[PDB]
Amino acid sequence: ATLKEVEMRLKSIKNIEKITKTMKIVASTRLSKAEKAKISAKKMDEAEQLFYKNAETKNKELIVAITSDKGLCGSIHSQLAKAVRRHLNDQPNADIVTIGDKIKMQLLRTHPNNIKLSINGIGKDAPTFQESALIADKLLSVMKAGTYPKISIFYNDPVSSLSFEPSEKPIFNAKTIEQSPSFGKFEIDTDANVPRDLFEYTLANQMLTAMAQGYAAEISARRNAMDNASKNAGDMINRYSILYNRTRQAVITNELVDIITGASS
């Protein structure tokens, strides 16, 4: 009727609220572990960066990007897609390697020449060295990473506890390491190819950090998003509650009139 169709729809809205509540709590739980990982990762990164800074290493072109497989984690997926698009204008010929289904789908739409290597299955777990290493190893073999005159990784830096801003950084090429402004009394090995080895080592060490920063931003976004969902759902509960209440009153009155009409005759 009005009453039953209203009533079932309100029940649906209620169930939606319950799910959005549940997810929001679970997301918070997941987030605490995520943050813990990211802290450790970031600490490690600073040590590697210490060399690059002090060395003042100063760098087609590769673009690498990070998002999870998982969707509905707010606008992480599409803000990063937008910043990939921005730097895809800049260099038309760059080969984009997409680590994550979500960035794969969005990027594939904007230019379908980009995708050369892509991953799938990374997003559902915390960053782990094992993952980074394997991706790195494949990055060298499959894409022949050393060829590019620029490597750049794009990720979502989890800027503040309620924000994420898409960010990029350049992984220095092996050529870059060689010719580095201060490659002063850095190095002593002329035998071991410290540039060609350090390149490989920082390919992964940098990538792991990027993945870690990303994972934290992703889970943080999902928490934020599911929180806003709960609020939006609440508003819908209240609005349909008023509709329900009115509809209920109306049915009682309308039915009552029919009985009256009969008695009156």
Partner: protein, 48 residues
């Protein structure tokens, strides 16, 4: 075998003694599929 792959195998070996926590074991587990693409076209996805 990349430099970081070289280190990777060594790390995997190091998680072998048996007194080690679950999180260590979890860090050795992985699950991924490198899906190659070209042009559009997609050469088949295969586990790392």
């Amino acid at each position: 075998i990349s430099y970081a792959a070289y280190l990777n195998v060594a790390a995997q070996a190091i998680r072998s003694t048996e007194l080690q926590t679950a999180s260590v074991l979890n860090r050795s587990q992985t699950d991924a599929f490198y899906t190659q693409y070209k042009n559009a076209s997609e050469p088949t996805p295969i586990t790392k």
